[PDB]
Design a protein around this ligand. Structure first.
Ligand code: AG
Ligand code: AG
Ligand code: AG
Lengths: 300, 311
């Protein structure tokens, strides 16, 4: 299995590529692409790590040699209209070289960039709405972290389902669906506030010198490794991700997803919410509906 | 168990802190320091990862709060890599930085184990040792030069040449951490054999493996992610030994019995107070014998250069 990382020279890409090189199953392939000329040396750097994952790096404007034979393409490129244009460019190169690969969108805003990728794939005739994901894992592992410390549990065993979007009030952690724990509304309100503002938390703490990179690479790695496991035949792999579903909420919506050999195999029900969980649900569906149309207007 | 990472805002430091945050034992402590103002957010970034490892980051020129109660100090500050000058551009840049931080270590966490990542390691460890002595707290069993990058590189290249699984190959590397001071004991890799051509070519590559990365990074970057991995392996092995695990062996640059030089890399049995026992380098090939004696007085000039700087 071959994984391509677009934008691998950035903070997120290098962290993601380091975890993939050390955690992808033996025999896997890892290709790194980024416009930055340093990218072929990022792969040589990683290639000195003694794991059974071959890795090669590519630079320049053409991403084709890195996408040839790619089964999964993770895109953390860019640094709104410059990032939207870069997303559109790279999805074009993917549709030309690896049209049936699974595509995980990391470049933000996810709510809008996934819509851009969808329209680019449709205009190419190679669109599979089961193979395009918006990577929202960071909200989940953030929720897991915050919940575990408040309630004194093992952080690695907490799993909070997060649904909706990847921006602000569109991020909805389903804290009522976490087993063995209850929360006061004072805790439901505060946790939902921090999870939807945790991105700002790292922005302020970095002295205006960057966004979340290492935790995002960790979250992107979790999603990529789950995807590879399910693509390789493992059963019962479920991750919450931002996909094009039934339209019951928006054209693009993040919910728990059963992953399979062809990307998504079942978009799981969101369960049954608390009262506040559907107040925050319906109370943002146009804020998510507007983010999607912004992505479809950009292409045409 | 509290681990302090000095220089945590750099490429090596950020990759190191990322691996430590996920692989350190549950209940461990991680403190990040770097003069760069981004360092507190580097820890807040890592703090959002659901592992039982608490983390906080500090900036300014005072590393005291990060070193407070530290059991291990990993220093990858300054310009910890890579090929500049013959190696003396880095010395003049990093010598004062290593001296500053090791000084702060000796007056806040003098009992902590110290791992020096900042290069030139052959010389920066001598700076650290002498600085700890004049502070009156020098423990020869608690000061290491991190040479693990040479080992995992040799594991990679040997597993590649001999068609073996990369995680199953372990190559002992002795001597120093630069050029001809890097001696991989290919004659001790269990279950494989090499030719003279392979020994000389593999050694040559391992001794200059940093140039593979520099010229590939378009001349504008060093080995950062592989170094963070190598430093993580060394730190995790040290922490395991510090928590009571027995049989933890890692090759690293320490002050030994001076059979070859005052400081020398060799297999080290690690214990609850740092170095438990300095193991013998075993029987050497004729090639490894020639390589050893042919590199000692340049290793000694490396050590002498660092001693002169502190007095
Ligand atoms: Ag796929
Ligand atoms: Ag110690
Ligand atoms: Ag060893």
């Amino acid at each position: 299995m071959k994984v391509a990382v677009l934008g691998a020279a950035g903070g997120i890409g290098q962290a993601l590529a380091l975890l993939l090189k050390t955690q992808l199953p033996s025999g896997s392939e890892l290709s790194l692409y980024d416009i930055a000329p340093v990218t072929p040396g990022v792969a040589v750097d990683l290639s000195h790590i003694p794991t059974a994952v071959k890795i090669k790096g590519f630079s320049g404007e053409d991403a084709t040699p890195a996408l040839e034979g790619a089964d999964v393409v993770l895109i953390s490129a860019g640094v709104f209209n410059v990032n939207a244009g870069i997303v559109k460019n790279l999805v074009q190169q993917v549709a030309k070289t690896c049209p049936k690969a699974c595509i995980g969108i990391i470049t933000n805003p996810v709510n809008t960039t996934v819509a851009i990728a969808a329209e680019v794939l449709k205009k190419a005739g190679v669109y599979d709405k089961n193979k395009l994901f918006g990577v929202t894992t960071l909200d989940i592992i953030r929720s897991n972290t915050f919940v575990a410390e408040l309630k004194g549990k093992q952080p690695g065993e907490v799993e909070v389902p997060v649904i909706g979007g990847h921006s602000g009030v569109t991020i909805l952690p389903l804290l009522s669906q976490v087993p063995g724990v209850s929360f006061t509304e004072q805790e439901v309100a505060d946790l939902t506030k921090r999870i939807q503002n945790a991105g700002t938390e790292v922005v302020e703490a970095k002295a205006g010198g960057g966004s979340a990179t290492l935790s995002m690479g960790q979250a992107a790695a979790r999603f990529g490794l789950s995807l590879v496991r399910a693509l390789q035949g493992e059963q019962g792999v479920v991750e919450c991700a931002y996909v094009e579903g039934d339209g019951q909420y928006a054209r693009f919506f993040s919910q728990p997803l059963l992953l399979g050999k062809n990307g998504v195999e079942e978009r799981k029900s969101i369960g049954t919410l608390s009262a506040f969980e559907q107040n925050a649900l319906e109370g943002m569906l146009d804020t998510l509906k507007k983010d999607i149309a912004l992505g479809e207007e950009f292409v045409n």
